[PDB]
Structures are given as C-alpha cells and as structure tokens.
Design a protein around this ligand. Structure first.
Ligand SMILES: [Ca+2]
Ligand SMILES: [Cl-]
Ligand SMILES: [Xe]
Ligand SMILES: [Xe]
Ligand SMILES: [Xe]
Ligand SMILES: [Xe]
Ligand SMILES: [Xe]
Ligand SMILES: [Xe]
Ligand SMILES: [Xe]
Lengths: 242, 233, 233
C-alpha cells in the first residue's frame, strides 16, 4: 500500500473487452428507394461500413494500450530491483571510500617509522663494527700480557732478561735475607787467600819458648787475616757492604 | 511526453434517439430496427474509443515517470562507476606500497637479527676479556705497588739484584777452595783480650793459640754459609 | 513489440452529410439534425479511435527503447557488484597487512632500542677494559724486557734467588750465636808480617796478640753485616 503515483495502476484487463456492433449489415433492399437520393443511399451504406471499421480500430487500440500497460508493470518491477541494488552499492562504495582513505594514511605513517628505524639500524651496525675492532685489539694485548708477565702464584721458577732493583729488601720464605748495602767499610789492603785452609789446625806449645811453635802461630794468623780479606773482597764485589 | 489530448473523451455532437422522432411509413421495419441498433453501436464505440485513449494516456504517463527514474539510475550508475574506478586505482596503489614496505621491513629484520647475534657474541668476548683482566690484576707483579709482593716460585735475574738503586748481589764468585775442619757458630767475644808478660808463659801463649783456632773456625762457618747461599763457589 | 498496424488509421471515407442529398420533407425536426450530428460524431469517434491507436503505438515504441536501457543498466549494475565485492576483499586484506606490518615494525623498534642500550653498555665495559689494559702494560714486570726493572716494594720469593742461572741467595742460615764486642771496619792489611823472637826475648808478641784481636773483630763486623742483611740468623 505504498506510493500510487498518478497515472499508475497495473494493466487494466477491461481494455481487451471488444465492442461488438449489434446492427445487421445494411442490405440495400431495406432502404427507402423512392424517398432517399442516390447520394444519400450511398452515404448511409458507407457510414454503415465506417461504424464497423471504427469498432475494429477502437478494439485494436484498446488491445495495444493493454500490451503497453502489461509491459509497464514488468518494467516497474525491474526498476524497483535496480533501485534497491543501486542504493546498496552506493552504501558499500561510501564505506570503501573511508577504509581506503584510512589505509592509505596508515601506510604513510608506517613508512615514516620504518625510515626512522632504518637510520637507527645503520648507526648500530657502525657502532658494533668499531666495537668489534677494539675488542679484537684488546684481546690481543691481553694474551700478549699473559705470556710476558711475572706471576705471584706460579710455582715453577721464573726468569728476567733484566737486572732487578727492589725497595728496602729481598726475602725467601718470608724471611728477610738481603737489605740495603752495609756502608762504613774501609777496604782491606793485602793479598787474599782462597786456597786450602784447615780450621782444625792445632798449635803445640811447650813450657819453654820454641821458635817452631811461635812461628806456626803468626803464620796461621797471616793466612787467617788474608782469607778474611778474601771474604770481604767477595762481599764488596757483590755490593753487600761498602 | 504524455499527450493530454488522449485523456479528453469525444464530445458527441449530440445523441438521444428515442424512436418517436423517426418517420413512420417511410422506413421499412428492418431499417427501423437497424437505425436504432446503429444508434446504440455508435454509443458503445464512442465509449470504447474513449476508454482506449484513456488507456493509452495512462501508459504514456507511466512512461514519463519511468523515463525520469531511468534518468536518475543512469546518473547514479555512471557516478558509481567513476567512484569505483577511482577506488580501483587507490586500492592497487595501497597494495603495491604495502608490498614495498614489506621488502624494507624484511631487510631491516635481517639486519636486526644479525646485529643481535653479533652483540650476543661480542658480549661473550668482553666478559671473557674482563675475566682475563681481573685474573692478571690479581696475579702480576706491580712495579708501582708499595706493599711487599710474594712470588710462589724461585727467582732468576740477569746481571744483578739492587735495593734502593745500589747493586747488592751479582754473579756468584768463583776461585774458592772449600775450607776443611769444624765450623764454630757459637759464643765469640771479639773483645777477648790477652795477657802478654815479660817471660815465656806457656799459659798466655796457649790462650792466643786457642783464640786463633776459634777465630779460624768461625771463618770457616761464615765461608760455609756464603757457599751454602751460592755467593761463592 | 511495437505493432505498426496500431498507427495505421481507419479511413472513414468522409463525405460529410449535407442538406443537399437529404430528403425534401419526409423526416422531422429531431431526426434531421440527429443524422447531421451523427455524421459528425461518427467522424469524431473515428478520429479518437485513430489517435488512441497512435497513442498506444507511441507508448510501445517507447517501451522498446526503455527495455534497451533497462538491460544496459542491468549489465552495468551486475559488473559494479562484482567490482565492489572484489574491492571489499582486497581492502580487508590491505587492512590486515598494514596491521601485520605494524606489529612487526613495533617489535623491531623494541629490539632496536634494546640493541642501542646493549651496544652503549658494551662500549662502557670495553672502554674500562682498554683502561685496565693500558694500566697493566705500564705497570707489569716483564720476563722479556732487558733494561733494568725497579719495584717500589720489597720482594719475597720461595726457595732462592739466582742470577745467570746460578743460585746466589737462599733461606736464612740459622744456628748462629751473635758475636759480641767492638766491630772493626777500619783500615786493615791482610799481609802484615810478624817478626818472631829467637829466645822468646823481645817481648812484643804483643804484635801477634794485638793482630789477633783486630782480626776476630773484623770477623765480628762482617758477621754483623751478614746478620743485618738477613743471610744468617
Ligand atoms: Ca514503459
Ligand atoms: Cl586499500
Ligand atoms: Xe462510430
Ligand atoms: Xe720480580
Ligand atoms: Xe737477592
Ligand atoms: Xe803468640
Ligand atoms: Xe623496521
Ligand atoms: Xe675488551
Ligand atoms: Xe700484566
């Protein structure tokens, strides 16, 4: 019961109902021959022919009007279908317009973030590269130190290709053994002795003088002060005393 | 457009035949019936022609209404076609750009991944480095530390050992013959004095001799010690 | 569907009725005009039926044209529906992809920020290591260096000190009693002969005794020296 535009209505079937002339075809023999002119006699029969023909035309026009109407009804159904489909497409397309506009803007936004990221990556590679070179270098210096340093914990003897100077003292076993050079010494004149020497030499001594005895005493002293010159020579050569 | 003439019915120049206006005794009976029947036929035909025109008029009025709706469909469809083709271009472009971003992001993921492995490895190397370094700092001999330093091993040096800058111990001294006898490391008074009298006194001499023997035995003890250290051969 | 026959008029052979072929007094008042008027309304009904026909024909020709447009509109709507659905699919896909990329890029930037911190921290640890290393290089005692090396601290070793491979200093020799008295580090003379006697006559054996004292006093001084260094008790 929706819209009823003027002039609209489905096909009117009555348009097909034919008018049927009920008058019997005119036979000249029923006409007034004495009283009607010949021209009027011809006119009456002619007008009789026309009435019948015009009825044919009117019936045909009605039929043609009906076909047009029936076709209109069918095109109205199609127009309505077309109308529904267009309205839905317009809605679908309007929805797409927005989603496409948002996608395009999300793409532009992603590009900025990736371009930034790319920059950070480039620098990170630069920093890691350089770092690698420094680590390799430090690592070489380390192993180089490890093969050349003196260990406080090594148990096997270690040697130095150089002389050594220490502060205030040397010790072994935790006991001082050597210190600063002992000064205040005057060098011993004379000829040192390092040859044979028997510290268990006895000296006989009698009740009366005896040159033999006393000589062996002063000589054992000479050989003694001399070996003492020797020991001193050795201690000064090292540097333990002045 | 709809022809208005179609809706205007025929105006009959006038009818109203009643059969009392007809001439009697001039028209045969038949022609009489005919004239009345043709009267009603004309009537029925005038109406059929009017109804047909009205039917043709409605069809045309409906055709006009449909031409208007068709015009509207045509415009909306061509505009939808413009909008959809436009969308086609933009969707295609958005799609290709996403593909281009993926190649870049994928490339970036590959570098981030290798960076991670590299830093991870670099991490292992540095720790190992710090550990070797801490070990050294705790086990090397410092030329600068003041606190006494201990070596758990024997030491061997070249040329000499100094303290405060003065040479103290050099190379072992050779040219020695081992002194024989029994060493004396006990009591020894360097201030031991002696009595020398005018006349041979056996006791006084013996004293000297005895004190000489002790002195010689302490000399051997010192020599033994020096030799034991290695200062002399 | 347009039927052209609809446009073909019914020609009524019009010879319009007059009072020139009509009977001279036979039919009355009404019937006279009624036949004149009927001749006119028959001609009018004919015109109306003919135009109604023409109107039906025009509506049909128009219907045929509208059918052509309806089909064209039908085809274009069908194609647009396909295109719009194809677009629905692809747009949703592009939207998915963008989202998927967003999680990847978001993840990546989290990793990048993490690498920047680690690399930063690694730089700190590497710098410190390089500093500890340069400190060691300047402070360690080398086993290969030739120039003399100096320690600011005392040295302690185990079992012995050597020089040139030969032992020179070992553990402190113990068991010594310290010699007492005055130490003599003054002028000495290892070779100062002693003229003896003959007959004991010539007392002065004071020389032998006096030289025995100086000797055992210099022995005491050397002993002090050894004990001061630490080589003996
Ligand atoms: Ca139509
Ligand atoms: Cl899109
Ligand atoms: Xe008619
Ligand atoms: Xe050392
Ligand atoms: Xe030493
Ligand atoms: Xe003596
Ligand atoms: Xe990225
Ligand atoms: Xe390092
Ligand atoms: Xe070191």
């Amino acid at each position: 019961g929706a819209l009823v535009p003027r002039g609209s209505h489905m096909a009117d079937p009555s348009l097909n109902n034919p008018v049927v002339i009920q008058a019997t075809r005119l036979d000249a023999s029923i006409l007034p021959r004495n009283v009607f002119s010949k021209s009027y006699l011809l006119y009456v029969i002619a007008q009789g022919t026309d009435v019948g023909a015009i009825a044919g035309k009117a019936n045909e026009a009605g039929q043609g009007a009906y076909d047009a109407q029936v076709k209109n009804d069918e095109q109205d159904v199609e127009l309505a279908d077309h109308e529904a489909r267009i309205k839905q497409l317009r809605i679908d397309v309007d929805d797409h317009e927005s989603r496409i506009t948002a996608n395009t803007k999300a793409i532009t936004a992603l590009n900025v973030r990736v371009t930034t990221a790319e920059g950070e990556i480039a620098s990170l590679q630069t920093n890691v590269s350089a770092l690698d070179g420094r680590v390799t270098t430090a690592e070489n210096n380390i192993s180089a130190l490890q093969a050349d340093y003196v260990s406080k914990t090594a148990t096997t003897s270690q040697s130095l290709a150089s002389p050594l100077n220490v502060t205030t003292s040397y010790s072994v076993g935790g006991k001082k053994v050597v210190g600063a050079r002992q000064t205040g010494w005057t060098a011993a004149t004379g000829t040192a002795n390092k040859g044979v020497f028997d510290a268990d030499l006895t000296f006989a001594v009698s009740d009366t003088y005896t040159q033999s005895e006393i000589q062996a005493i002063a000589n054992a002293l000479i050989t003694e002060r001399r070996r003492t010159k020797a020991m001193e020579d050795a201690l000064r050569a090292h540097g333990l005393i002045d």
